[PDB]
Specification:
This is part of a larger assembly, with 2 copies of chain A (481 residues), 1 copy of chain C (359 residues) and 1 copy of chain D (481 residues). With 481 residues, chain A is of the alpha+beta class. Helix content of chain A is 48%, strand content 13%. In chain A, the strands form 6 sheets. Chain A has a 4-stranded antiparallel beta sheet. In chain A, strands 3-12-15 form a 3-stranded antiparallel beta sheet. In chain C, a hairpin with a 7-residue loop joins strand 1 and strand 2. Chain C is mostly helical and 359 residues long. In chain C, helix 5 packs across helix 9 and helix 9 runs antiparallel to helix 10. Chain D is of the alpha+beta class. Chain D has a 6-stranded mixed beta sheet. A 3-stranded mixed beta sheet of chain D has the order 3-11-4, covered by helices on one side. In chain D, strands 1-2 form a two-stranded antiparallel ribbon. In chain D, strand 6, helix 8 and strand 7 form a beta-alpha-beta unit. The chains are: A alpha+beta (481), C mainly alpha (359), D alpha+beta (481). At the A-C interface, helix 5 of A face helix 1 and strand 1 of C. Chain C: Its EC number is 3.6.1.-. Chain C: GO terms for molecular function: ATP binding; ATP hydrolysis activity; ATP-dependent protein folding chaperone; unfolded protein binding. Chain C: It is an enzyme of class 3 (hydrolase).
Chain lengths: 481, 481, 359, 481
Amino acid sequence: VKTLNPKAEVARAQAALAVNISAARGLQDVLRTNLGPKGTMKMLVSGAGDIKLTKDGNVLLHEMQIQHPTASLIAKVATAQDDITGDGTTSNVLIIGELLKQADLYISEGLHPRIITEGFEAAKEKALQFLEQVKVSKEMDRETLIDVARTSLRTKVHAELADVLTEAVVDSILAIKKPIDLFMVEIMEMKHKSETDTSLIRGLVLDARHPDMKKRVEDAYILTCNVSLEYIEDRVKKIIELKGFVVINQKGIDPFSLDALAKEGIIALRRAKRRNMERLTLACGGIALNSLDDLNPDCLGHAGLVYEYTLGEEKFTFIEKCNNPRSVTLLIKGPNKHTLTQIKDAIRDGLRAVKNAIDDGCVVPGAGAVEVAMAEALVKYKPSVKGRAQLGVQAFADALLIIPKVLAQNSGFDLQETLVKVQAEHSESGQLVGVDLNTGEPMVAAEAGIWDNYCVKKQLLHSCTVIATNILLVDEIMRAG
Amino acid sequence: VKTLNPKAEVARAQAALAVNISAARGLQDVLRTNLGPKGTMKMLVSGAGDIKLTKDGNVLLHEMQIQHPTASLIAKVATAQDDITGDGTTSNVLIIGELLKQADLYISEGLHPRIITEGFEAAKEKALQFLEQVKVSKEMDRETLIDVARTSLRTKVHAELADVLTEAVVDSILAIKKPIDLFMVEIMEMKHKSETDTSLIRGLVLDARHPDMKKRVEDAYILTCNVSLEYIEDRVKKIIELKGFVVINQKGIDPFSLDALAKEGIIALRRAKRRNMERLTLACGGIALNSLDDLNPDCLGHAGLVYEYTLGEEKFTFIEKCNNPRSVTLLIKGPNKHTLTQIKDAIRDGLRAVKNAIDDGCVVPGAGAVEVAMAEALVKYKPSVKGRAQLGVQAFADALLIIPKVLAQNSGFDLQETLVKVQAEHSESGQLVGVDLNTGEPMVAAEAGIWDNYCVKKQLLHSCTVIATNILLVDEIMRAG
Amino acid sequence: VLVLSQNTKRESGRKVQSGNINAAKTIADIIRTCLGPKSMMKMLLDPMGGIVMTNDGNAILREIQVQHPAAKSMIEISRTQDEEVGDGTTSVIILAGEMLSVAEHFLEQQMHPTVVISAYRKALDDMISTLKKISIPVDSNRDTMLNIINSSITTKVISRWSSLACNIALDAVKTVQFIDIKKYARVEKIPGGIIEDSCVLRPKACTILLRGASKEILSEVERNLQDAMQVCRNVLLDPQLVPGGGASEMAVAHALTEKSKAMTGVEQWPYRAVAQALEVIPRTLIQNCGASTIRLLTSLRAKHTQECETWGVNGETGTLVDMKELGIWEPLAVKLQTYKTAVETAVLLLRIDDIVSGH
Amino acid sequence: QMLKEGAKHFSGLEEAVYRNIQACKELAQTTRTAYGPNGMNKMVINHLEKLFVTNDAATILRELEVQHPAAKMIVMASHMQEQEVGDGTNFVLVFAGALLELAEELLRLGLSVSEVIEGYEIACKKAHEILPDLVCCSARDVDEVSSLLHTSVMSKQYGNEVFLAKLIAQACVSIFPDHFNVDNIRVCKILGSGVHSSSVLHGMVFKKETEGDVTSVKDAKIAVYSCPFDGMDAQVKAIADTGANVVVTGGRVADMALHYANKYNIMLVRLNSKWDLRRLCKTVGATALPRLNPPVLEEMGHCDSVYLSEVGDTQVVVFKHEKEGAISTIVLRGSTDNLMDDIERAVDDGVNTFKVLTRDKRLVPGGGATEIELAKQITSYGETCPGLEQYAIKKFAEAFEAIPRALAENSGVKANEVISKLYAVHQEGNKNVGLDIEVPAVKDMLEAGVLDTYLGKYWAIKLATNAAVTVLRVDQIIMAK
């Protein structure tokens, strides 16, 4: 009686539950050593000479070809933490992992799975609500932005020059805010020189065609166009009539058109990336029509200084000094191209946090300060709900204490020892007490300047508890071979 | 390295602790099946096919061929719990076991054994001191004594006739207390009839050899004789002249000597256990002379009523109404012999229960009522000690909650669920809150009569902590020489 | 000898009841957990690394590659039930499995099938009369219809904006109601925005214009709405509704059992077997709550036989409560077909005493 | 290490239940065939290559090699039941198993073992209350006597002479039943002719050894001796002076002591078992005279008839016709040892049954009738007793349905059909309604004659119950190898 296909491993009772939780807890163990400002990056070597060295949890869980039908879900959770927010990706992973382990404790004791489910759900209500009662209301000031932007850059490779990058971010976000929009920061990486050369250019930066055309224009009227300029003169005559000194073409130019434009002293470039064409229309405020006879003075960009400097034996056309650069470009110079990839990803997250910071003057005491708090709040919240839930809530509180523990773990200090000191002081000073590894003792986060955005934290518990519990209900899957 | 001899097992590192913990835990669970009023006695069969069926934990752990070096130790714990106190022998085994469980949880987390020991130890002292604050003060009150002795008989076989036996226990203990002495209560078990005929005699009960010897001597003067009355009439002449109407001989009596003794109206018995002779000299005030010619009218014990009535087709010699009303006999009438075996153990504990009740006016609410209390107390005592020590106390408190859990276990009810109710009701009613399985809900143990002696609880924590912790130190035994 | 083509398996007599019954019983216990709001959605991973997370018994049976014909007929039971109304797909499956589980037992006592089946088919007729003898007749009427349609949208991805979907289903069904036709309600789903930007488009046949931010979400809003319309299609054919939470099953059970002693004979047992089988609904129900199934069952039939039929299993309180008072009602049609589709299947399934395959 | 030593088979919880229950079922069903006139005997042959053909369950179990713990408990139930009244030996067995079977099914469902016992124990007391009310009291009275004796003779190999074995046992137990005792009945298995030749001798039969002696002594002056007659003249001469014409020596007799006893016309009998001597002292009034010098005329018992009959071709002295013969002898006759064995086995039973009457007149219509009634009553009782116990109580009764089930079983009648019919007709025909195997159909047992002893049933329920309960508690037992 073969009711199932051959080689169809099936898990029913505790088996599935246990096997599932373990797989998630394990992965949480592989991503736990990169949390906090002292965490350590990871080098993902995809059997093929490929070496991906990053610290971000998501990226890592996206490169590792996991087979764990459970870990995949975990990889999905971290994905919902990098999109809806950015950093903290790691944190969320450790929460769901450790949490499930806390439940397993209850289950193996006799507690019904679904029953424990409501616990974390009911405790989640309190956990989130508490975040609301601990959120320190900040402003869009530069300092608070430089302090939070830096902390974001830290825990990474550029931690060596986080101070500088942080500056470039606070300026890029302050210049794009009028309702912020990160999609206004053109991240352009370029090798050569050290990472201490990264600058914030307030305009596009390409990578004059004919040697007879001017090479350095003072105030060039960007007359961007798409259609090719080849079959030619009638096309060149219309450009000079529209007062277009610097024509940025998307396609190549005809050899007999480059001499005509070079004659009028017109600076025209050919074969420009489509992304750059859009970044130049939003930065210099110019319109890039199609044909040539259509262009007009109404589609001219107001650049302030368009020169061509070969910073690295590679001629680069810098179209800076824009009237209102709604499209800021954050130039990034790094020693190795690989270093750029990381720095770039770091900024992308660093900028994100800032956006949140200016989109709401709110922030929570990081370094585990919040966790230690919620945990303490839930402990006093369990005797009220009572019932088998009391345990669920308490367990949820203990699970939240994983953040501080791990921190001391990645620092080199005693896990339990630190937890005690931090908890004692916390139950004294307040929501301002956190775990400062840089000192090896419980300090005031709000004082040291260590703060975390609201959205981040909030999203963490949500994506966690929610998905986390679901896995717990899945007592079977049924497969084949 | 060859410091050991061939064939020498060695426990090393965590391995030892692991095997030890699981060990003590396993045997702890096996004996946990006979705890409570719904417990289940076990039938141990040694090599000779013997069949030991009892409920007491100690005896069980004394018949089971334990190969676990740790369990063996757990056997020494249950022993020191039965020799010093007695009842509850099981309770101890569970505590120490569950205790190690809480510890290991911590050890595997990274916590060092030493710090954990200090944690439990810190809770022990406080615990023992709490039992001194929660002890119910009563007195030699006959009422409370009946309750305790009754509760003791319960959870066993005689639980069917607790009311009767209990009463007899109180009386026997009230007439043997000077400073109570159990060696003054002779427990005589006899088959035939039901166990509802058990009576309490105030003398001696031996289990006239010749058909011509009086079957009832009034002021029967016992002429204790140890030597044999065989190779005769001259020995019988020396007794009649010493005025010995009741010659209780320790050795056999020559058939011809019985005819000369019965011809004089002398009531002589033969083959009397040495232990019965010494009990006849300490009750009637007689002197046991070796030779038959060393006896005299001044070595005859004074008896009031020595009658030989049938206790089930078997004529027993009752020598009650002794000149010293401090020597009582607890006759046990019951069905089979095996039944009286268990019952006899019940009285042994009933007498000891009442004994300590009068010698110590302490009577704490058993049925876990105390456990839960101490637990909650420590939970609020751990925040005042903090450090990794906080954990120790907590764990010790969580280990104390095993008793109430096991109660809801052997009963069938939900272990965890019930625990919440009892705990929630204990912190609302007081120290009188216990786990009443007969009602399937937490009730006032001090209202149902369920009471336990202070000595028990007190001695408990003592024997537990000491040994338990010591089992965390011995990380290697190595069998060499 | 090869009476029939080599390698052609042929179970006979008892060898058939075994492999057939169990296989069906087992497959019924698989999606069993996926019953109630405490459902345990399994993560079906096809033999290719797939990841199918679902609660619906049908969707699950359509993912698990089955080889034994008996378990295949089940996947067909959920195909018919899931097409009619939708929900309760697991109900009809769990019942069909139990009936075989309680039947096999009787087979142990050597109760020839002929007798059994006879009692099963007849018992089936009893439940139908019972269902109607205790159903709560509720009104058309926009108000009522809303409640009915709402309860059919409170468990899916559309529950988010059930209220809106209800008014949409109510209108689409109340308008194409001449017996209402489920083919006159055109559903025009358009990706983009939130399900809140929906509006019924009016007519002997309207044109409901749904909206869905995604492609999977939009099709879901179409199905749930169609189901929300179905219940409305029932209030037009079966304006009867019986209390859920198991209240129904318990009643029919207590009734059937009583009838057993009145019928006596050999079929006196099967009658009870079917009644006791209906107890699985409230049993497994409370189970999804982590509460004592047995204990509950006791107190259930307790206050149930004493104070009307208005009592049912309260999963949120893990105790028995007056369903009627709480406002828990389920269309009689929902229950009506369930018992039917179930018993029927089990019946003819028990008539299968051999299956000519190939290996 | 190993939790328990080597060679120690253990079982915990359900694991044990299954084994105990199973072993008991097979053992209870094995003898189940030995029930009713369809009782299928068995042939057990021990080490000594001895063939035992018996229908009595007790005789079977006490000859089968049982080493299973729980299984041995069944041997005890049959042992006690056989010692109580004899009849129903198999009743207890089967029933005991059914109980465990219904109970085990309750546990696998999730029900607590505790409740199981309670429910069963409570129903055991209810039944012991229903039986005494439903029972059919009968009238002593030779008319009623033969009725019960006639219903206790069937179901065996001597059913061909159920009329003879009825009168034979009716006469014996009606000559000295003061307070009747089954020990005053001596049955003899003499080979020769069919059982239709069995006779009833008012006295005690044995085998003499001397020929020339008086083979048929009138008013004999019996003198029971135990001391050997070896050296012989003064010993035999001192017996002729007292007037002892009948010598019943316990040990051997010297050839010269025989020739002298042969010359004094004194019928001497040597090699007389110790029990035959005691039975001869309480039938004629003889005194157990040890030595051969103290005998006198007041130590001689009177036996009006002491002849030498060679019935079946084997000499046998018949000491019949005495003053107060308190012990009669049943002279059995058989064509084969096989038939002689079975007959006697059943004779004893009837002796016990009659002994039940002298201490209990009550009787119930057996054949399953009473069982069904109790089942009916108990079931209803369960519905009157709320709580989870309602299930246990009803299950207990469902067990009684195993008795009639076995009845129609050893007959080839579909239980499912006969049972359902029985109950229906039983709920209308009341108690009397039962099952007549000789004619597969319901029938009034009271009319059919089939009437069992009330006391016979009583003990059965209690013994079986208490026993089964015990085996269920001990759910964990290793050993001590």
